[PDB]
Amino acid sequence: LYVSQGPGVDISGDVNLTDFDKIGWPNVEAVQSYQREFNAVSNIFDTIYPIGTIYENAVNPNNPVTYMGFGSWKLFGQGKVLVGWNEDISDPNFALNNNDLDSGGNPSHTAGGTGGSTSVTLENTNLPATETDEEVLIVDENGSVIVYTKYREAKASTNSTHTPPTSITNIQPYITVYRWIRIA
Amino acid sequence: LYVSQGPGVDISGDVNLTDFDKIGWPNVEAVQSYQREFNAVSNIFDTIYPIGTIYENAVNPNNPVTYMGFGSWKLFGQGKVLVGWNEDISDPNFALNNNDLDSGGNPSHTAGGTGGSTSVTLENTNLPATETDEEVLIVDENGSVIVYTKYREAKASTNSTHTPPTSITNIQPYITVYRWIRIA
Amino acid sequence: LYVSQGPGVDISGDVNLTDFDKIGWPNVEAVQSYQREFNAVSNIFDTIYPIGTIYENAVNPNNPVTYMGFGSWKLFGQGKVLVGWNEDISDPNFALNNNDLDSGGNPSHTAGGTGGSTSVTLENTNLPATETDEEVLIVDENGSVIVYTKYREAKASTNSTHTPPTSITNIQPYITVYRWIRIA
Ligand SMILES: O=[P-]([O-])[O-]
Numbered sequence: 205l206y207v208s209q210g211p212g213v214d215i216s217g218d219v220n221l222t223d224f225d226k227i228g229w230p231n232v233e234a235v236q237s238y239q240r241e242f243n244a245v246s247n248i249f250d251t252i253y254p255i256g257t258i259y260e261n262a263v264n265p266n267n268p269v270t271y272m273g274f275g276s277w278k279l280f281g282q283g284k285v286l287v288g289w290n291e292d293i294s295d296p297n298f299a300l301n302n303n304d305l306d307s308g309g310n311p312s313h314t315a316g317g318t319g320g321s322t323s324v325t326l327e328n329t330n331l332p333a334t335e336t337d338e339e340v341l342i343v344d345e346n347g348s349v350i351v352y353t354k355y356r357e358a359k360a361s362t363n364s365t366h367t368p369p370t371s372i373t374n375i376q377p378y379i380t381v382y383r384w385i386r387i388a
Numbered sequence: 389l390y391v392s393q394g395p396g397v398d399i400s401g402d403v404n405l406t407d408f409d410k411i412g413w414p415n416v417e418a419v420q421s422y423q424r425e426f427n428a429v430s431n432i433f434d435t436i437y438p439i440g441t442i443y444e445n446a447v448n449p450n451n452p453v454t455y456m457g458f459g460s461w462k463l464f465g466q467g468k469v470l471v472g473w474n475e476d477i478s479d480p481n482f483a484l485n486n487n488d489l490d491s492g493g494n495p496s497h498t499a500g501g502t503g504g505s506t507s508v509t510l511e512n513t514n515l516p517a518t519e520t521d522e523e524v525l526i527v528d529e530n531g532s533v534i535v536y537t538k539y540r541e542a543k544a545s546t547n548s549t550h551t552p553p554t555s556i557t558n559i560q561p562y563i564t565v566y567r568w569i570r571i572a
Numbered sequence: 573l574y575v576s577q578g579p580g581v582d583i584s585g586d587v588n589l590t591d592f593d594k595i596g597w598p599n600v601e602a603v604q605s606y607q608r609e610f611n612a613v614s615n616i617f618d619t620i621y622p623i624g625t626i627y628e629n630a631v632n633p634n635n636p637v638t639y640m641g642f643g644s645w646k647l648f649g650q651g652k653v654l655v656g657w658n659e660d661i662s663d664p665n666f667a668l669n670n671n672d673l674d675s676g677g678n679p680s681h682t683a684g685g686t687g688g689s690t691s692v693t694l695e696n697t698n699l700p701a702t703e704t705d706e707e708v709l710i711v712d713e714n715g716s717v718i719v720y721t722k723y724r725e726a727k728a729s730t731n732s733t734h735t736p737p738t739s740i741t742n743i744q745p746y747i748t749v750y751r752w753i754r755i756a
Pocket residue numbers: 331334362515517518546699702730
């Protein structure tokens with residue numbers, strides 16, 4: 205026996221891209237509602253992998269059309285992890301899209317925000333207060349202690365040659381995959 | 389010609405949710421084995437996107453039912469990266485689910501554990517041993533050195549006003565996407 | 573009415589694995605072009621979830637064949653985040669595959685590279701230059717200052733017992749999921 209088309213479905217929330225070079229908001233448009241009938245496999249494919257879908261393959265380097273048969277696809281998020289967009293606008297990282305600013309420079313509440321860093325290089329502002337393990341002689345106008353080499357009165361450096369210091373990884377355990385977006 | 393239904397399949401490993409507010413273990417139940425016949429497109433959809441499936445779209449903000457036609461969907465992992473659950477129980481981060489504790493407080497060996505942080509603020513306990521670049525005069529009961537301003541004998545602070553210091557990012561390069569779970 | 577098979581598709585970019593134990597390049601082979609006709613649901617499944625596809629389920633612990641009906645599947649990227657492979661070979665982390673080296677030790681430009689760390693432990697090389705908040709007496713052959721306890725002339729330690737210091741998390745906010753690769 206054969207697969208029934210079933211009742212068609214009202215596709216009311218589709219989108220299309222309006223830029224295929226730089227991908228994402230603001231260059232996305234809503235598609236007016238239309239009926240999808242499952243006339244053929246291509247229509248099923250469109251219901252499974254609508255425009256914007258992210259697809260990942262661990263090993264196949266080729267464009268997905270060559271091994272799926274359908275869709276137009278582009279590499280997506282190269283060098284990036286995916287973070288879930290947050291509907292809570294107070295999220296300071298994952299709600300507001302720095303790549304889609306309004307005329308006042310204000311980011312939209314859309315997916316496609318980017319950020320993060322592969323390493324960090326510590327600066328003095330990042331260091332907590334510390335003290336020497338032992339007492340030393342400290343210059344003090346309110347002090348009570350009266351004082352082969354001579355000495356100088358100066359702030360004592362530590363790590364003066366670390367300009368800059370060695371960076372530290374900021375990357376958690378990963379594996380890379382071929383990641384694609386369906387663009388049309 | 390038409391797509392054959394094929395031999396049906398024995399779906400022996402399906403699950404359903406028993407809480408749609410707080411999602412995940414422990415509120416998941418096994419479904420007794422049943423036969424799936426591919427009578428219509430909806431049945432194909434259920435084989436591709438079974439309950440629990442994670443779906444991601446870079447650009448479409450809408451609920452996937454509105455552009456797929458099928459399923460019930462909820463945003464998932466907002467503000468989070470996905471980590472692969474580890475079948476090796478000795479993984480200290482990614483095996484045991486802190487959100488699903490037994491009566492003794494012990495986490496289950498299930499997916500849905502959460503953790504991680506967007507930043508770190510260094511504390512003194514995180515700092516390695518250091519020393520001054522030059523010699524200074526250090527108080528020492530076993531010492532041999534006899535000793536406009538006076539001085540005081542005290543531990544010398546560094547960065548005393550860094551209470552707290554500036555935090556450091558803990559986020560690696562990302563892009564946000566609309567991420568969903570099929571809940572029914 | 574019934575779903576049409578449609579015109580078949582030329583699958584020119586499929587791959588197969590040649591090792592199911594250790595997964596990935598170099599043990600991947602190209603499949604010569606073949607025609608896929610959508611004779612049955614299984615053929616549709618192969619177009620949606622070709623070999624190498626990554627599938628994620630938040631809650632279902634079982635092997636996907638038991639709840640999809642099709643494919644052979646293995647857990648993938650346990651304990652890992654997925655990063656998009658970079659077609660730009662200059663990416664120092666996410667382009668070149670450390671798990672697939674040539675005879676000179678040079679990594680291939682393929683997905684499957686791994687790296688990253690769950691924590692960092694700071695070392696002295698990572699620290700920026702600092703100085704004491706106040707002036708102290710510093711040994712100086714070019715100095716002009718002539719100098720209950722005695723003293724010693726020595727470099728003053730800080731945090732001498734931090735051998736090693738407390739590690740710091742390197743994990744950004746996450747949730748774990750059951751992640752699988754279709755291996756056949
Ligand atoms: O304050 P840090 O130089 O040990």
